[PDB]
Structures are given as C-alpha cells and as structure tokens.
C-alpha cells in the first residue's frame, strides 16, 4: 500500500462511557462509524425519563456530541439506521429527528427490532465523512 | 485535508419519493449508502399486492432504478442487508435476490425483525461501490 | 475516474460455505464488508451445539478466518453490529466478544432480533479495513 490509513478512537465525556467492548465512534481515513446511540445521560448512565421521544432526542443529542469530537456536525452524516421498539413511533421520531438532521438528509434504514439494550426504546447507529465534504446536485 | 469529498444525494422518480426525512441514496466520494428498500409502487405510494414474493421484487426494482441514477447497476453492489418479517421466507426472497445478483455476489446479512415501515414483508439496504471497477481474485 | 478501485470477493474453506447467494466478505479498495457470521462449523454446515455461548465463539472463529485471508485481524475491525435472539445474553456475548477484540474497539450496534438463520443465537457482521493503519489518538 501507498498510505498508513489513520485510524482514531473518537472519544468525548459529553457522550456516555462505553457500557461494552465498543468505542464511540471509530474514524478511519474520513470515515466515521458511530455506534448505536440510546437516549442514556451522559453523567448518570441510565435512560433519560419520558419514553421515546425523550429518549430519541437523548440520544441524538449523544451523536451530536460524538461528531462534535471528530470535528463535524450532523451534515457529515451521510447513513443511519433508526432502531424501535415499537414501529408505531416511526412519526414521532421522525420529527425529532428533523430538528437534527435539518439538511442533506442521510439515506436511512429503519425498521422495529425485538429489544433493544437496557431496555431503550430507540437506538441510532450512523455512518458520517469527515469534511471538507462539496454538496453537488 | 487535501481534497473535498463530493457529496450527492441520489434521486429519482423511477423509485418512491421518501416517506420520511430521508435520500433514496448518498454518493460520498465513490461509496453510495442507499435506504433499506421496500415494496412501495414509485407511482402509487402504497405496497404492491401479493406478499413478500411481490414485494421483494420490487423493492429489488426500486434499488435498481437508485443505482441506475448513480451511474452503477447491480455489479457495483458489495453489502446488503436483507430484513424479513418471516425468517421462513428466506428461501422465496433468495430466489428473487439471485435474479437481481447475477455475479460478483455482495456480503449480505439476513435476519427476521418484528415490523418493517408499511407493514412491509421485506426491506432491503445497501451500500454500493461507484465504478470504474477491476474485479480480481 | 482516475482509479478503477480494486473488487475482490474473499473466500475461505476455513469458514463456512455461503448458505445463499451472498461472498463470505468484500473487499474494495480498502474496505472489507464481512457478511453477517453464525455459529456454524466449516465442516458439518451446521450450528455447533451448547447454545450462544458457543455460538459467538464459532461465529467469531468464522470471521477471524475470514480476516486471515483479507490480510487482515480482529484489530482491522472499525465497526460490528450484534444480532442476538435474547438480548439478556449480552453480558455473555461480551465476555467471548472481548476473547477476539483486544485493542482498538470497533464501533457497534446490538440488538435484539426476532430471528436468525438457523435458529441461531447470534449473527455478528463487521467492517474491517486493510492495513497499514497508523492509530493515533
């Protein structure tokens, strides 16, 4: 190979500590994985109270924190996949999730799963390129 | 950096408009993440008839028309994630994969979720590869 | 374009024959796309017996052979996603999942299917990147 692709653990206490063998976000060259995000409070490891929309909006707000640290913000993202536990939470979400994701929409996949950890009621996993990134047509 | 990564959202009205805040697709240099696909008519807005058989061949159709307007075609396609509402399926929708997925065959997960948007039968995502390629061994 | 990108479907006898049409991994470019792992042994084609625990170990095995014939480790894993039957055997997932992630922890999403092929307990897919990586901080 011609390069040594650079490979970082993003990390920020903004964002709950690691509750498993997992990282944030791992960015390797400009590409950024960030692991599911849950509506957990970055200082007291447990889920926001409210139910879902609380919690998408907890949890968004832990992805925000996450991008912060690798130097963007939620127009860097480019995938994400929507996690319920109940699909019938689909539209609630989604107007959360307009009041982060305001532009260049990610393409998206989302679908109702079984259970998710510590009993959340969304979880959001994303893919996000680090910038300067030119928005065509 | 030394470049700016070219970002587009890839749309066309040969597969249906977005029912959420969402891009059928996102080009990000050469990587195209497209949306998990369903069986939605792009004319009518509403699932095809005939269950899951149908509606994976059109939701294969729907993928076909977002890779089209990336310039690719199925042989660009090198992960895709097969969701079902039936595990039981799984022979059915290979049957309709494997006349979309000719060569090259992608990484693929598979797995039963317990509801899909629309009470759909299937949704299928994935992430393709803009060409030119040189397929080696 | 100024580069025809490198696709190669990576295959090994030492992790199972594909059960569909679907290649063990992808790689392109740079990046390999590993197929959704189960605990099947290479031989038989069947789930080895004694239930998630043994499951995750075969399945992880699986995906380590895979690596080896990409070039690749465990450390060249920058995200997983965990398919489980029962989310209450996260705790024991963990356990095995840090026998083969060391260092450099992938970023991750888990959750908690309907179904799995073959009944299996658990599905684990990943994305890996081919070396060399420089890990900063």
Request: charged share 10%; glycine share 12%.
């Given at each position: 190979q011609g390069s040594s692709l650079i490979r970082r653990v993003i990390s920020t206490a903004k964002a709950p500590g690691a509750?498993?063998?997992?990282?944030?976000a791992v960015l390797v060259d400009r590409t950024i994985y960030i692991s599911g995000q849950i509506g957990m409070d970055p200082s007291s490891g447990q889920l926001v109270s409210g139910g879902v929309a609380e919690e998408a909006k907890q949890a968004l707000k832990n992805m925000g924190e996450i991008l912060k640290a690798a130097?963007?913000?939620?127009?860097?993202?480019?995938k994400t996949t929507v996690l319920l536990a109940?699909?019938?939470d689909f539209n609630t979400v989604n107007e959360i999730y307009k009041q982060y994701f305001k532009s260049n929409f990610p393409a998206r996949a989302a679908y109702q799963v079984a259970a998710l950890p510590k009993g959340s009621r969304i979880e959001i996993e994303a893919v996000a390129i680090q910038g300067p990134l030119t928005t065509a047509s």
């Open positions: 509750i498993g063998p997992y990282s944030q130097g963007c913000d939620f127009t860097n993202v480019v109940d699909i019938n």
